[PDB]
Design an enzyme around this catalytic site. Structure first.
Site: not given
Ligand SMILES: Cc1ccc(-c2csc(CNC(=O)[C@H]3CCCN(C(=O)COCCF)C3)n2)cn1
Lengths: 211, 195, 216, 206, 211, 230, 211, 216, 195
Positions: C1-2
């Site tokens: 995830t970013t």
């Protein structure tokens, strides 16, 4: 790292007066997935003796190749083919030689001896073995062994029918492997049936469910 | 390590237990008095296992049963007593378990002479002959070989002597002192057998 | 995830990937959640923990917004919404929501593993970025906030390219390039890019399909 | 391993207007010592509802007591017998109420659904109530693999009460003879809408 | 197990296989994995069977209670919210991977619910041991706008892929088509001995009781 | 090698009308870090045998060096094109290596696909073998094509098409559903590209930078690596 | 497994069951546990079947070589010492052997108990296996040195029966050999204990026997 | 630790920090070691393991260089040194040394945790970069290689700023900025920057004192 | 569980040990013959522990000592014998050790009657009275109370009877059979004491 996996599949042996039947499936699987739908489990050792094993496929294949190597070397050295009993003691010793890092392979050695009588030896991984009139190794062994006991022994039936023929035994073995395929997830796909009698080994195929 | 034996016939029931209080590698006593729990009404609870658990569970059961027999002014049936005991053992099984093996014996007019075998896990069943402790492994078979439903009490006691002899000779703990309850003829008799 | 957030001249831009889980259980996930018309939050960490935290915080935000209302009268695919509350009279402060989130996450931080980035706009302090960290520590950022396994790769990149008073266009370009680089380098991030732009008067959501070409 | 302490096996089968429930009669201890041979695992809830409990003996007895309590309460409050399907659902919910500290029991419910039409009803459970309704047979206990083999190979559909008795008894005995910790006698109960046949088979004591 | 779901024009198609396993052994050959939550909401499950079944019954009955009280058609959002709250209340335990489909005022909504309490709105999803094969088929052939017939064909092919490639999956193919107006639950959508002599078994005693 | 550190993801191999076609993405990973994205995960063993690997990169490189030495030894003792080792020979060799390491609890953390053509009857490339420099395709029977799978435990077998890693789930479903005998190159590429697209979409360790290798009547052809169309 | 041996007026009586099981599953009930070491010495099998079989055959090999070399018959004490010394060299590797070597030599009738731990206990009444306690109890309760061959055989048969009856791991068939000055004889080659239960404990056979 | 290597036309450039070990055991440690006059290597991981590996590889390189010699005749602080061998006649190839290093590290990879970056120049392949990874897998880079706990933060940064044929000056600027950003973000890296520049005819060694100023 | 007792006087030395050979919870024998190892030359090695280790260690020591006494044609001194035994036990202490407790007794013209106490760790010392096994905890004190250096052998045997009585009454294992070696007046006698 655990060095043992169980590739599944079942081998059923059954002897008659002068014949022996070894029927094994061919599915090769890992966990819930199928490597392949055809990996023969039964190897020919001599024209009157075969071996079928269930367990970890690589161990089974190496063990079968080693048996064939040693049997051919025996033929070239002592100038005669070993009996099924000689092969049985040889395989017991080969298995116990790895007693502390055992082959993960339960075995059934089927054949016709010099006196033309069906012989079935069943082995566990570390070498312990016994002669039997009906055996089953693999995932379906606990499902199938009672069927063989109810059909071949009839210990718990007063009215007993004993006259069996090769065709009846072949159909019974087909029914037993069908039931194993029905109830065992690791059993299925094509099954090879080897029949050894005076004329030698005959191989037939039967299709089983594919799910 | 607490050997208990029970035998039931058509006209008797005999309980037996070695008389040893043990503490570590020492016999505290050769005249234990914490295994048998007589319950008024020809009932008897024979308990095995650690002494503290035996005392606690046996006294709990005994006082509850006597409370029942006083409040209602009646004798609790032997089957009701046995299943009440099994219920109480199972209740604690998962909370505060008494590690005690149990032989519930008793005579009743409804069901005759009764012997119930129950283990620390509360697995209870009615039996004709039962054992508890390591000594069970050396006495049960004897009880199986020499038993018939129409035994007299004297034959039962001779079988118990056979069991005690095998416990002296072959059992690792050379137990020699035993206490026996013999319910029969509407009387409960206490016996002490040495060797 | 970013998940990333950048403050520019007239707003705050949140951006996130959409990949969930070496098996990609969900390749189109909603990591930027709309707490309120002017207040958005980006999730990272445990999906269940973060989702339940968002549900709780939405409940609290509804309560806060309702209570604020004083009595009487006064006075590349895009979706654009205007604020129904023109003057931010009753919209809860971004700081209030971020701090109650920090309280909730810290009280139950023995097993709640959730990292959040709050972006928003209120009339007191204008546009805002807060970072609610793993173990329950809130930090108010005035330039940008990053989180997720994929935002580590862009750190230097971002720090090089950030300027104090970006324009909307160049801020959008920077945040898109940041997310694209993070996706390129991080195996745990990927999929369509979701961007939210929060301003004084409106919020617009962009969806971007992407590809990383470089002749290095 | 908990189920290995006592062993035991229960087997249900259905025919044409008949239904058979059988069990082994052993109560063991520490997985190898046979302490009783009269430990029946079949309990009658009512004429149309029977249950077979396998697993830990203490859990079997506790669950039987709980089921009897609930069923007696239901029947007295309704002045009518509990329906077999309702009993199955109640047993599932009772099992699941102890999901995390369960009774180590693998029950099967057998009986007749009344519609008069008496349709055989069978269902098996796990220890936490996960239930499978099956139309031909149900198995529970340590001997489950052997019993599945038996009912797979030998089950014949729509057998009269004698045929069903023979098939179920053969299945049970053949499965038990391959099991160390289950056996020492076999009990068989064949229900038909008019009567019950209870038989004790001449089994091995090994 | 193999459960899948997808969203087609104005409908949700759920599909599932029909096998339950006590480990290596097929315990049930015709198990039903599509579960009725409400007329417009259905769910399918993978994981601890008791957990799936009882959680589904709880959700169904709570949804019926809510519908009775509010006189409003249930919402897939409400179902997923209740399910997530219940699953999260237990810190991971009570494992239930659930495909929850329905059609409500907001159109056809499909959700995937993780055992830990996470939900995801999806166009198509698969869960279970054969989940990867169903996903392979769905990814390969799924498209945004599909007829109900096309959705059913895709679901059936995906479930068949799971059945014939996963050892934990097998049996029939159940499918359910849910629309805003009604549902159709095609249970069997696709479907890919000895009689002993009377008196052969000895007994020790016999008791006859007449009801 | 306690465990895998630098990992390579799925490898697919199939038989088509003109020979063997083996695809693999050119990416290596460091946990969730896509540290290398131009890695060669398919190795040419000899003119008629190629090697694909999944898992640890160091163990795959060690095995590739072993097979390179074996090929050079074979060429050194070769006299006619029939003396060249076949793909089946190399498959058995790799299986024996993996088994002996299994017996020493020192496994290579790889899944290996050894593919190629078993027959010298379809060409004359090995009459004059060239190691340093590189008509129409001849139809090859599917029996003369060899594809062998080996895993960490030494589980060795062969099939018409083989997959490794996550391909064994996603790609294998499509292969079993759609694979047919005597496929043209166009169809083989279409099928493999659909499988690789699925893998790119659902495998976090997969890349869309592909490497296709063909083993055919004219030897081993390494294609131009390409990004997956869409 | 339940093996036993006892010394009496006319020589030695050796008795065994014939069950081999793998956990709770009975794999065979026709195992030969009394192995012939040489013409005069018999051994039994308790514990690891593979270990006992392999090492007793190896002891037979060593004994045969010794007899050929020294033109003499080996004594039971010497063979038991050889077996114990070999089994001690493998201390710690998990060998599970319980063996009773009983035979006749120039020093009379001898009987030794040897286990994998290195034990070499000499005696005149031994039992090995999961059912050894029951065998000891039954034998002790009725052991007499001056029993006739028939009486000793009956005692051994009854002890084996009771052990099989109380013990899960014992059963199958009872085999009883008699060792005398001129070898050994199979007094009972094999008798299924199903008949023995209904001969000893429940002869009337009209109801279930209650333990 | 942060070790980086970049390739510019006419040379290769290695760079590293110098911090060793939450206590800085050695704040000025030499990570770029000189295997040969034309061949340098950067160390990362366990200091003892990498140092011993370098000693072994220097021993092997001396052996190889001596054995290569054919018979007969033929034909900001900086330190610069030309190659004694003007034609690379006996200087061992970069690939040979890197691969023997990979062999050594792989043979003993049960306990040797060492990551290396080889930079060098030989007349066959001109300038080369090789990366020897944790278990002993060698990958030849043609643009750049990075390693260490601090080089993760610059990845995207580097990927954006690298160009195919950088000049010496701009390559030097790029590698210096990379190392500076890596040390700014990574606590396990710091101190003076050591840079080596390997070319066709000479090797330069630069030492740089640093400070990260920004107005983000 | 193998009780060993040793007593040394001015004109005698007596070893004693219970005669139980055990296997799990059963006595294999009530007359063991694997604890005492007579060594030619009025030497005796009394071993306790596990039967396999006892046999191996005792026979190894016995054949080595007899080999020494035959090769040299002389009797090994009791001190040399004891320290050779301790050396051999210590050598294997760190490689497949024998878990055996040892009492070494003997008589020489050089040091008279000699008793040595050695544990499985091979901690050895010369003593006047020693014990091994759990029974030690119940007999050592008795030996301390009733011992004097000028005891006659008969008084020593009465002290041993006191020890056996305490082992029957208070020790958890009601050991009743004991075997005694009595070295005195140049002769070595074997005695069997029951109860
Ligand atoms: C002395 C003796 C007696 C019997 C056997 C023997 C060997 S086989 C057999 C009959 N069959 C079984 O006992 C199966 C029971 C369940 C476990 N079994 C498996 O095969 C499962 O393992 C899969 C891979 F190995 C074997 N009797 C060997 N020596």
């Amino acid at each position: 790292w655990y060095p043992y996996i169980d590739n599944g599949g079942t081998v059923i042996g059954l002897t008659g007066k002068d014949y022996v039947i070894l029927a094994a499936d061919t599915r090769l699987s890992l966990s819930y997935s199928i490597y392949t739908r055809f990996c023969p489990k039964i190897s020919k050792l001599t024209d009157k003796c075969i071996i079928g094993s269930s367990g970890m496929q690589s161990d089974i294949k190496t063990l079968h190749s080693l048996l064939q190597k040693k049997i051919q070397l025996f033929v070239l050295e002592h100038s005669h083919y070993p009996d099924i009993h000689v092969i049985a003691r040889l395989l017991c010793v080969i298995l116990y030689s790895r007693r502390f890092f055992p082959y993960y392979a339960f075995n059934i050695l089927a054949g016709v001896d010099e006196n033309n009588k069906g012989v079935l030896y069943n082995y566990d991984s570390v070498g312990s073995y016994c002669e039997a009139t009906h055996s089953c190794v693999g995932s379906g062994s606990q499902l199938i062994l009672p069927i063989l006991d109810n059909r071949v022994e009839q210990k718990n039936q007063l009215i007993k029918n004993t006259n069996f023929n090769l065709g009846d035994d072949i159909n019974f073995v087909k029914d037993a492997i069908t039931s194993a395929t029905e109830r065992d997830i690791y059993t299925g796909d094509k099954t090879l049936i080897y029949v050894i009698d005076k004329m030698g080994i005959n191989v037939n195929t039967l299709d089983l469910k594919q799910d | 390590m607490d050997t208990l034996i029970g035998l039931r016939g058509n006209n008797f029931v005999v309980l037996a237990a070695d008389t040893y209080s043990i503490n570590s590698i020492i016999k505290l006593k050769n005249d234990d008095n914490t295994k048998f729990y007589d319950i008024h009404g020809n009932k008897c609870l024979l308990l095995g296992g650690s002494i503290g658990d035996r005392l606690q569970f046996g006294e709990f059961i005994r006082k509850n049963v006597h409370l029942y027999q006083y409040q209602n002014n009646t004798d609790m049936f032997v089957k009701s007593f046995a299943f009440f005991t099994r219920k109480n053992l199972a209740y604690y099984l998962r909370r505060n378990p008494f590690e005690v093996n149990c032989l519930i014996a008793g005579y009743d007019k409804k069901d005759g002479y009764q012997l119930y075998w129950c283990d620390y896990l509360s697995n209870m069943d009615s039996v004709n002959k039962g054992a508890h402790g390591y000594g069970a492994y050396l006495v049960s078979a004897i009880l199986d070989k020499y038993y018939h439903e129409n035994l007299t009490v004297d034959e039962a006691l001779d079988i118990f002597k056979l069991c005690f002899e095998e416990l002296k000779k072959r059992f690792l703990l050379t137990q020699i002192n035993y206490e026996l309850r013999i319910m029969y003829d509407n009387k409960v008799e206490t016996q002490y057998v040495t060797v | 995830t970013t998940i990333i957030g950048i403050i520019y001249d007239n707003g705050v831009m949140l951006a996130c990937d959409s990949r969930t889980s070496t098996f990609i259980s969900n390749k189109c996930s909603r990591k930027i959640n709309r707490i309120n018309e002017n207040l958005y939050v980006c999730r990272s960490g445990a999906s269940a923990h973060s989702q339940k935290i968002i549900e709780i915080i939405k409940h609290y935000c509804v309560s806060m917004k309702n209570e604020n209302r004083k009595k009487g009268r006064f006075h590349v695919t895009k979706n654009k919404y205007f604020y129904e509350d023109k003057f931010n009279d009753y919209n809860p402060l971004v700081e209030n929501v971020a701090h109650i989130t920090k309280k909730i996450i810290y009280t139950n931080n023995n097993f709640l593993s959730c990292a959040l980035i709050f972006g928003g706009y209120d009339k007191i302090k204008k546009q805002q970025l807060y970072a609610v960290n793993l173990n329950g520590s809130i930090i108010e950022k005035h330039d940008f906030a990053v989180s997720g396994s994929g935002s580590i790769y862009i750190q230097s990149y971002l720090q090089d390219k950030y300027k104090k008073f970006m324009t909307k266009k160049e801020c959008f370009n920077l945040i898109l390039n940041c997310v694209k680089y993070a996706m390129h380098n991080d195996n745990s991030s990927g999929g369509l890019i979701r961007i939210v732009n929060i301003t004084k008067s409106f919020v617009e959501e962009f969806t971007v399909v992407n590809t990383q070409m470089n002749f290095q | 391993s908990i189920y290995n302490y006592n062993g035991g096996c229960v087997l249900g089968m259905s025919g044409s207007n008949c239904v058979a429930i059988a069990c082994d009669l052993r109560l063991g201890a520490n997985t190898f010592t046979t302490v009783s041979t009269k430990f029946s695992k079949i309990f009658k809830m009512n004429n149309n509802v029977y249950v077979g409990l396998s697993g830990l003996a203490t859990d079997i007895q506790t669950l039987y007591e709980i089921l009897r309590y609930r069923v007696n309460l239901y029947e007295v409050r309704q002045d009518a017998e509990m329906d077999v399907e309702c009993f199955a659902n109640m047993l599932s919910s009772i099992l699941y109420s102890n999901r995390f500290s369960p009774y180590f029991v693998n029950p099967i419910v057998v009986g007749f659904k009344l519609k008069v039409n008496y349709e055989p009803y069978l269902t098996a459970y796990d220890l936490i109530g996960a239930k499978c309704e099956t139309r031909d047979f149900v198995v529970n206990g340590v001997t489950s693999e052997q019993l599945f083999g038996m009912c797979e190979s030998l089950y014949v559909k729509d057998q009269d009460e004698n045929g069903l008795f023979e098939t179920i008894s053969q299945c049970l005995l053949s499965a038990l003879d391959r099991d160390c910790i289950s056996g020492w006698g076999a009990e068989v109960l064949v229900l038909t809408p008019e009567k019950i046949i209870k038989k004790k088979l001449k089994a091995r004591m090994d | 197990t193999t459960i899948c779901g997808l969203v087609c024009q104005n409908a949700v198609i759920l599909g599932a296989d029909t096998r339950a396993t006590e480990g290596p052994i097929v315990a049930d050959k015709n198990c039903s994995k599509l579960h009725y939550i409400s007329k417009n909401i259905w769910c399918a499950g993978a994981g601890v069977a008791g957990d799936l079944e009882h959680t589904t019954l709880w959700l169904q009955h709570n949804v019926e209670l809510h519908r009775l009280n509010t006189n409003t058609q249930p919402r897939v959002s409400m179902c997923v919210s209740r399910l997530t709250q219940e699953l999260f209340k237990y810190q991971g335990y009570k494992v239930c991977a659930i495909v929850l489909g329905g059609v409500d005022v907001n159109g056809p909504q499909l959700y995937g619910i993780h055992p830990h309490g996470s939900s995801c709105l999806l166009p198509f999803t698969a869960l279970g041991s054969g989940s990867l094969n169903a996903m392979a088929v769905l990814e390969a052939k799924y498209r945004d706008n599909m007829t109900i017939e096309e959705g059913k064909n895709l679901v059936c092919e995906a479930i068949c892929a799971g059945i014939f490639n996963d050892l934990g999956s097998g049996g029939n193919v159940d499918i359910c088509v849910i629309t805003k107006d009604s549902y159709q639950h095609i249970r069997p959508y696709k479907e890919p001995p000895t009689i002993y002599p009377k008196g052969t078994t000895p007994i020790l005693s016999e008791k006859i009781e007449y009801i | 090698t306690l465990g895998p550190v630098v990992t390579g993801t799925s490898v697919i191999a199939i038989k088509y009308k003109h020979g063997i076609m083996i695809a693999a993405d050119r990416k290596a990973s460091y946990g969730s870090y896509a540290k290398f994205q131009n890695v060669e995960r398919i190795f040419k063993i000899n003119n008629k045998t190629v090697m694909g690997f999944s898992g640890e990169l160091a163990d795959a490189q060690y095995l590739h060096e072993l097979l390179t030495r074996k090929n050079i030894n074979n060429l050194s003792e070769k006299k006619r094109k029939e003396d060249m080792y076949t793909p089946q020979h190399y498959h058995s060799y790799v299986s024996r290596v993996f088994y002996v390491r299994k017996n020493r609890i020192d496994p290579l953390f790889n899944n290996i696909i050894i593919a190629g053509i078993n027959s010298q009857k379809y060409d004359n490339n090995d009459d004059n073998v060239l190691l340093y420099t590189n008509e129409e395709y001849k139809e090859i029977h599917k029996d003369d094509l060899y594809i062998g799978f080996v895993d960490m435990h030494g589980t060795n077998f062969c099939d018409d098409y083989i997959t490794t890693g996550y391909a064994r789930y996603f790609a294998l479903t499509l292969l079993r559903d759609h694979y047919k005998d005597n496929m043209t190159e166009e169809e083989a590429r279409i099928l493999i590209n659909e499988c690789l697209r699925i893998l790119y979409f659902r495998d976090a360790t997969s890349s869309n930078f592909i490497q296709i290798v063909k083993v055919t009547s004219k030897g081993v052809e390494y294609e131009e690596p390409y990004i997956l169309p869409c | 497994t339940t093996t036993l041996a006892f010394k009496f007026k006319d020589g030695i009586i050796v008795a065994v069951d014939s069950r081999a099981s793998m956990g709770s599953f009975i794999s065979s009930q026709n195992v030969e546990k009394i192995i012939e070491i040489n013409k005069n010495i018999l051994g039994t099998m308790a514990g690891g079947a593979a270990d006992c079989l392999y090492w007793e055959k190896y002891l037979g090999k060593i004994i045969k070589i010794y007899e050929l070399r020294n033109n003499e018959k080996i004594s039971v004490r010497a063979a038991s010492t050889i077996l114990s010394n070999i089994l001690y060299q493998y201390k710690g590797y998990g060998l599970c052997c319980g063996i009773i070597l009983s035979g006749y030599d120039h020093t009379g009738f001898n009987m030794f108990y040897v286990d994998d731990s290195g034990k070499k206990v000499e005696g005149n009444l031994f039992s090995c296996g999961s059912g050894s306690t029951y065998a000891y109890s039954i034998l002790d309760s009725a052991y007499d040195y001056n029993l006739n061959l028939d009486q000793a055989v009956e005692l051994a048969r009854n002890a084996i029966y009771h052990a099989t009856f109380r013990d899960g791991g014992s059963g199958g068939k009872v085999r009883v050999f008699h060792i005398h000055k001129n070898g050994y004889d199979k007094i009972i080659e094999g008798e299924d204990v199903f008949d023995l239960h209904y001969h000893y404990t429940n002869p009337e056979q009209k109801d279930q026997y209650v333990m």
